[PDB]
Design a protein around this ligand. Structure first.
Ligand SMILES: [Mg+2]
Ligand SMILES: [Mg+2]
Ligand SMILES: [Mg+2]
Ligand SMILES: [Mg+2]
Ligand SMILES: [Mg+2]
Ligand SMILES: [Mg+2]
Ligand SMILES: [Mg+2]
Ligand SMILES: [Mg+2]
Ligand SMILES: [Mg+2]
Ligand SMILES: [Mg+2]
Ligand SMILES: [Mg+2]
Ligand SMILES: [Mg+2]
Ligand SMILES: [Mg+2]
Ligand SMILES: [Mg+2]
Ligand SMILES: [Mg+2]
Ligand SMILES: [Mg+2]
Ligand SMILES: [Mg+2]
Ligand SMILES: [Mg+2]
Ligand SMILES: [Mg+2]
Lengths: 218, 88, 129
RNA sequence: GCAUUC
RNA sequence: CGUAAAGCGCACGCAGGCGGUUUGUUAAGUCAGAUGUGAAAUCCCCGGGCUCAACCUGGGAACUGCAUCUGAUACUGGCAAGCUUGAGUCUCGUAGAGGGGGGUAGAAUUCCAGGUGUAGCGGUGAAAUGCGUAGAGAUCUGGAGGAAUACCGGUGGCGAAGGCGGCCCCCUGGACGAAGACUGACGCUCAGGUGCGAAAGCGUGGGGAGCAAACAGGAUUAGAUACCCUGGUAGUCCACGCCGUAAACGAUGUCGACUUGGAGGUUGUGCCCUUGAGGCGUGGCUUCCGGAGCUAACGCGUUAAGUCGACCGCCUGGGGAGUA
């Protein structure tokens, strides 16, 4: 529901003209979002997300900025949904079949560590090869068990994650995004105007969807 | 261009009163006064081409106004040219 | 200088539709109102209004369907430099009848279909699809 | 510093 | 028709083309119907006849035209009366290398005269021609004359374009803003025409410091009618006339309307005002980057090369040739 924070936007210099409808005014030289318009669209976002959630669909969280990199992972632990916390590899969805073998390599790396077959005297097995696990995990950690294209895309920034939006649009996957004043609309089917980088803003966002998904999943 | 006192004198002479400045008679009379006044200027400064271009605009503007007045009312046009002693 | 006010009315509609503008306002005239009335009847424009007496201003309420402009295309046909008149049998039909052509007949301004039904020709104003 | 041609 | 061929160098403008808005009238254009005519054949449509076809033939349609008659009045035009939003005049201000004329100032170069002073100076990649013991260069004093205006100076300003930089005066053009008043379509464009139009060049008469085609010498080089060096005439400057050409370029004609934005420069103006080398608005001009759209692409992008209207100019493979 409506509460403190989130309303804060960015400077009027970097505003996107396409977002004129969702700006309430230029307060202290920085645009502030119209909350009365955000709640209807936002409430629609959870309702749509709940509907697909009841269909056992797979939701994907896309957060790359350091401010929310750990936040998305926390939601991915509160619910069984998938996420991307670090750089979005170009083509994670367009050529998913190409990325499948990369996931399989991570599984093999994970296995070799579990049963201790990697504890060979050589540093090559001990150090060089095991350093690939965290390199792959930090980028493919939350997508390991997706097993296919997501049924919906959730994005914290529509411009910082413009690559992810393009892939989802190409594949026809519905896109939900926390679109900011400076961000580019028309690439997201469901737009949630508001702040994208404030810590207290995102946590409410991914926290809200992380909840309604659980009720929809049942 | 033209002194305010001289401009006021022409307005009251040709127009209905001191406030009727838009009348074709006032506009034509004002242009004629400046054109005649500038005759001495170009007698001495023969190659003041840049200012002469402005003078030709007044001549062209006066001709357009005179033709409009002639079309609108011939009788008024005939009286005006007689008073100003032009169209020779 | 402005020499074809009708083209300005059509241009404003075309530019406004491309800009996703809710409505377009322009100086009003009897011919513009007559053309606007035909557009409103055919469903191309939601509504139109005239405000002011000394300097009336004509406002047109544009309409959109599925987020795209209803008026796919609108072009002036008869122009001050070249005016076009058509007989009853020569009345054109836009997009094989899906569109309409606004015709200024002796009985007023009406679509090509109306003029054809009435059996009266006249000046072709514009094609709007 | 100058330094052509196939 | 920015770069592929193609926007006159830029303007003013007659003929011509086009023209805001309201009422009445006219019914020329336009539109409807009828009448006369539009020969026959031919073409076309439905039939008939040569064994079929070609071919022949009946009727219709067609001959998109012209003329008259009767009507229609929306649009265009004519006529009459209007209206203010286009355009224009007036009042108060602002900025500017806008133009013409006259005067004047300082720095510097060259030259002339004199003093001090002594063997180099000048120049190049190197060198030489050249200047100098007849006293150069350097340095100081005074005088003469010409040309251009350091700093300010800034993708700053002004002008139709070309173009216009010290300062002062005289004459003078245009632009822009503030409200208010006035005229009431007087407008836009423009073949021909006319005016202006860098530099070089030409004519006459002056002037001539610097610079410098031509020319001369010294170098360079296989040669060097060049680049480099030392000299140097026309010219560059002024007066008046002529020439009318430039990559005269934004390689982008003029006018008007419409269409998301961001950051600057410049010049007016409104308002909040004690919490000023402040806060929010509204005009003119102008630079840069970019959205839609557009474009062959590059790119353009509210100052369009986007979306439209009016008028003019111009292009139709290369070369020959903008030549005979
Ligand atoms: Mg070329
Ligand atoms: Mg070319
Ligand atoms: Mg008219
Ligand atoms: Mg008639
Ligand atoms: Mg016949
Ligand atoms: Mg037969
Ligand atoms: Mg009329
Ligand atoms: Mg001409
Ligand atoms: Mg010269
Ligand atoms: Mg000479
Ligand atoms: Mg001489
Ligand atoms: Mg030389
Ligand atoms: Mg030429
Ligand atoms: Mg030039
Ligand atoms: Mg050219
Ligand atoms: Mg040009
Ligand atoms: Mg003109
Ligand atoms: Mg741009
Ligand atoms: Mg020749």
């Amino acid at each position: 529901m409506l509460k403190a924070g989130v309303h804060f936007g960015h400077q009027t210099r970097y505003w996107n003209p396409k977002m004129k409808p969702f700006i309430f005014g230029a307060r202290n030289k920085v645009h502030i979002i119209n909350l009365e318009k955000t709640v209807p669209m936002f409430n629609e976002a959870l309702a749509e997300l709940n509907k697909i959630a009841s269909r056992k669909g797979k939701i994907l969280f896309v957060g790359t900025k350091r401010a929310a990199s750990e936040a998305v992972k926390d939601a991915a632990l509160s619910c069984d949904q998938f996420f991307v916390n670090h750089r979005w590899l170009g083509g994670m969805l367009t050529n998913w079949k190409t990325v499948r073998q990369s996931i399989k390599r991570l599984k093999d790396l994970e296995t070799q560590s579990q049963d201790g077959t990697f504890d060979k005297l050589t540093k090559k097995e001990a150090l060089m090869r095991t350093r690939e696990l965290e390199k792959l995990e930090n980028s493919l950690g939350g997508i390991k068990d997706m097993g296919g294209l997501p049924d919906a895309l959730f994005v914290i920034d529509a411009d910082h994650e413009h690559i992810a939006i393009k892939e989802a649009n190409n594949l026809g996957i519905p896109v939900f995004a926390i679109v900011d004043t400076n961000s580019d609309p028309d690439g997201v089917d469901f737009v949630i105007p508001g702040n994208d980088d404030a810590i207290r803003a995102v946590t409410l966002y991914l926290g809200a969807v992380a909840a309604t998904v659980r009720e929809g999943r049942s | 261009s033209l002194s305010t006192e001289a401009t006021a004198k022409i307005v009251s002479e040709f127009g209905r009163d001191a406030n009727d400045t838009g009348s074709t008679e006032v506009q034509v009379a004002l242009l004629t006064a400046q054109i005649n006044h500038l005759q001495g200027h170009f007698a001495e400064h023969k190659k003041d081409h840049h200012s002469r271009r402005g003078l030709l605009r007044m001549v062209s503007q006066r001709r357009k106004l005179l033709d409009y007045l002639k079309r609108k009312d011939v009788a008024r046009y005939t009286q005006l040219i007689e008073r100003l002693g032009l169209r020779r | 200088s402005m020499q074809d006010p009708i083209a300005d009315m059509l241009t404003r509609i075309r530019n406004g539709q491309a800009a996703n503008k809710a409505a377009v306002t322009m100086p009003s005239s009897k011919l513009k109102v007559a053309i606007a009335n035909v557009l409103k009847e055919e469903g191309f424009i939601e509504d139109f209004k005239v405000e002011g007496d000394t300097k009336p201003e004509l406002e047109l309420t544009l309409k959109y369907f599925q987020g795209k402009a209803v008026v796919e295309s609108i072009q002036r046909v008869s122009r001050p430099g070249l005016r076009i008149y058509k007989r009853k049998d020569e009345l054109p039909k836009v997009m094989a009848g899906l569109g309409i052509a606004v015709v200024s007949t002796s009985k007023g301004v009406m679509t090509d279909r109306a003029a054809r039904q009435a059996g009266l020709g006249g000046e072709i104003i514009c094609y709007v699809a």
